């Protein structure tokens, strides 16, 4: 049974301009000290259609992990709009926070992200080519989806 | 542009149809055949082969 349990994720600076960084405050419990690193990563799903348009915004390492309750702040640069299909640029998608030990993902937190124009005319008539300077990214941080996977510690 | 799940006339969906609503014995195990559990050795040996299959996949 697992050595790490996420207590919380705080979505910070939300909503925000599409280009502003993602800011997360992650709190977790460690029941048994980890000698090696935990790898946390933030994933923007670019297109619902394919797993191929997913962007890894950043990745950080944490460790050794002593036992107890801990926090770190995970910030990452907003996704690169050149890689997002125009159809999917506006409207809903998903961002994911994930954690890995000895190569196996043991947890995946996910949030629905809405990319929306704050400009009433644009909302009415969006340009074929989406303008990302006009898009606000609202993360729904009231409905995280926490998904756990059994992994081998040691 | 789509379908309303409600649904005046949705009652059509909750109909009981016993022929479709129960299992048939064909392909099932009754009443005595090998149910023997997975032990320990075989369990880890199987979990082994799978962790490798999803590696190569």
């Amino acid at each position: 049974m697992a050595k790490v349990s996420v207590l919380n994720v705080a979505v910070l600076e939300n909503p925000s301009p599409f280009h502003s960084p993602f800011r997360f405050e992650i709190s977790f419990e460690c029941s048994e000290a980890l000698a090696d690193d935990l790898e946390w990563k933030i994933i923007y799903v670019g297109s619902a259609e394919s797993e191929e348009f997913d962007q890894i915004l950043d990745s950080v390492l944490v460790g050794p992990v002593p036992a107890g309750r801990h926090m770190f702040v995970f910030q990452a640069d907003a996704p690169n709009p050149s890689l997002i299909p125009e159809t999917d640029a506006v409207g809903v998608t998903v961002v994911l926070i994930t954690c890995t030990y000895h190569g196996q993902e043991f947890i995946r937190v996910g949030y629905y992200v809405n990319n929306e124009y704050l400009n009433p005319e644009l909302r009415e008539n969006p340009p074929m080519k989406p303008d990302f300077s006009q898009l606000q990214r609202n993360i729904l941080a009231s409905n995280p989806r926490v998904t756990r996977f059994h992994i081998n510690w040691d | 542009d789509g379908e309303e799940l409600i649904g005046d006339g949705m009652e059509r969906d909750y109909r009981a149809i016993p022929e479709l609503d129960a299992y048939e014995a064909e392909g099932l195990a009754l009443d005595d055949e090998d149910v023997e559990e997975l032990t320990a050795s075989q369990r880890e040996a199987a979990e082994r082969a799978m962790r490798q299959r999803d590696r190569e996949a």
């Binding site: 207590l7 995280p144 998904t147 | 799940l5 090998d34 559990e37 997975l38």
Partner: protein, 86 residues
């Protein structure tokens, strides 16, 4: 005149089931496109759980898939919750 014998036509899953599940999930309206999409997800879900359970059965040296063989495969799937524990 000219009577015809009925062949047995159960194959996969029809629309009423999809609506029943969608309704269980609070969905009040669906695209017609939802039906195909949903069968696909079910097939894919079942495929992965069945393949894992078959492999548990192959190792037990028997031709019957037991209930524990399924339970075990299901643990390989991962568990979604709507909040954080703690």
């Amino acid at each position: 005149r000219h009577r015809k014998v009925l062949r047995d036509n159960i194959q996969g899953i029809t629309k009423p089931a999809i609506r029943r599940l969608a309704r269980r999930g609070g969905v009040k309206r669906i695209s017609g496109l939802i039906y195909e999409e949903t069968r696909g997800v079910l097939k894919v879900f079942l495929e992965n759980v069945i393949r894992d359970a078959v492999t548990y059965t192959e190792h037990a040296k028997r031709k019957t898939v037991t209930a524990m063989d399924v339970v075990y495969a299901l643990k390989r799937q991962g568990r979604t919750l709507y909040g954080f524990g703690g």
